[PDB]
Amino acid sequence: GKLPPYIFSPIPFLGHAIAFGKSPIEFLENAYEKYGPVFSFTMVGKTFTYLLGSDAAALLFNSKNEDLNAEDVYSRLTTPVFGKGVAYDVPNPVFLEQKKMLKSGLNIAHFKQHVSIIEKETKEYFESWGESGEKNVFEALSELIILTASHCLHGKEIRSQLNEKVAQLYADLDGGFSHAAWLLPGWLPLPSFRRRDRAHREIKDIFYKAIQKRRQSQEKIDDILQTLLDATYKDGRPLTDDEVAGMLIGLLLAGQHTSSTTSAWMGFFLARDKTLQKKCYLEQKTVCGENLPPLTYDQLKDLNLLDRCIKETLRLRPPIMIMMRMARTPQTVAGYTIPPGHQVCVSPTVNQRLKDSWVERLDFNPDRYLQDNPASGEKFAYVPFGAGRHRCIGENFAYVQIKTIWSTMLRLYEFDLIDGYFPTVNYTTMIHTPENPVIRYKRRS
C-alpha cells in the first residue's frame, strides 16, 4: 500500500490548525491544487485525509459504517447534547432503524400542513420589521426557523410552551457544538459544558411532560411526535419517551442552524442580484396566483426558479462544509491506501466550487442547472445534503421550509443590500454564518 500524498507541517503537533481556522476553504483549495485530490493533514494529533473531487468523495459517500465509522468522530459531541440511546450513541443498525423511523414521519401528508404552518408563522413574525429599515438577517431568520421547526416537528403543545427562555436554552444547547467539544475532553467542568448539560436536562424534562400530555390526550392528531410514538422498533419494542425526546431534540437542533444560515445566504445573494429577485417575485405573482393565495405543497413544486436559487445558495455556501468519518479498515481511493485511524474527510463546499467542472465557480447564477452542469453530470459534485448512503433525512423538510419562508418573505418585502457590502463568511462558527448581516429592506408594492 501507498500512503496518500502527505502535507508537511512546520509545527509538530498543532499542525495547520491556525491556517484551517483562518481560511479552511482556501486552504483546502490550494492544497488540492498542490497535492492532488487525496492530500492529508496533521491537525491536533489527527490525520485529516481529505477527499476532494467526485472520484475521491465516492469512497466516503458509498462507504459502510463498518468501514467509515461516523460514531467514533461524532459521539463525544452529539451524545451529551442530544441524549443517551439516541442519535450516534446506539450501534449502527439501531441508528439506521432510528433514521428510517424519523424519515417515516416527514412525508407529503405532514408537509401539506407544514407549508401552511410555516407561512402563517413567518407572516406573523415578520410584522415587527415594519415598512422599511435594516435588521440582522441571520438572527431574525434563526428565530423564525426555530419557531417554525418547533411548530411543525414537535407539535402545537411544544410550540405554545416556547418562549425566550427556552429559545435561549436551545441556543445554549447548540453552543455545545464548538471548538471545546473537539479539543477539550468531557472531563473539565467548563461553564459552557455545564450550561449545555443543564439545558439538555431541562429540555428533556419539559419534553417528557409534553410527551406524557400528548400520550394522555384523547384526540388523535397527526404529527412527527405522534408518528414517532405510534411507530415501534423493527424488533417490536415500543419507542421509549427518552428515545423519542432524543430523536426530536436531534431533529430540531440539526435543522435550526443549518437552515438559518442558508436562508440568510440566499437572502443576501438575491439582494445582490436585484434582477433575480424581481424574477423570483414575478414567479410568485404568476405561478402561485395573481391574488397571491396562501401556499400549499402542490404549489411548492411550481417554484422552479426559487428551487434553483436555493440550490445555488447551498452550492456556494453549504452549511455543513465537512462530513467527517473515522477509518477503521484499510481503504483505497485514487490508488492511495488510507490506514485505519485517519479522520477521513470530505468537503461539500470545495466539492461544489472546483474550477475543474463548476464554471464561474464563485459566481451566483441559478440558471446553470437549466443547462448541463455537474449537479447532474457527476455523481458527487453537488452534495450539499450528502449523497449515496449518507444523506440528510430532512432535505425534503428543508426544501419545504426554506422555500415557504422565502416565498412569503419575497411576497412581503423587496430586499436590497446596504452600501453594496455583501456579508463575508464568519469562519469562527462551525456553521459558516454571514459576517455582519444587515439588509435595507422595503415593503413590496
Ligand code: HEM
Ligand atoms: C439547508 C438545509 C440543510 C442542510 C444543507 C443539511 C445538511 C446535512 C448533511 C450534509 C447531513 C449529513 C451528515 C452526515 O452524513 O454525517 C445532514 C444530516 C442530518 N440532517 Fe440536515 N441539513 C439541513 C437541514 C436539515 C433539516 C431541515 C432537517 C430536519 C429533520 C435535518 C435533519 C438532519 C439529521 C437528523 C441528520 C442526521 C444525520 C443523518 O441523517 O445522516 N437537517 N444534514
Ligand SMILES: COc1ccc(OC)c(/C(=C\c2ccc(O)c(OC)c2)C(=O)NCCc2ccc(O)cc2)c1
Ligand atoms: C447544530 O447541530 C447540528 C446540526 C447538524 C448536524 O449534522 C448535519 C449535527 C451533527 C453532527 C455535528 C456536530 C458538530 C458540528 O460542529 C457539526 O457541524 C455543524 C455537526 C448531526 O449529525 N446531528 C444529528 C444527529 C442525529 C442523528 C439521528 C437522530 O435520530 C438524531 C440526531 C449537529
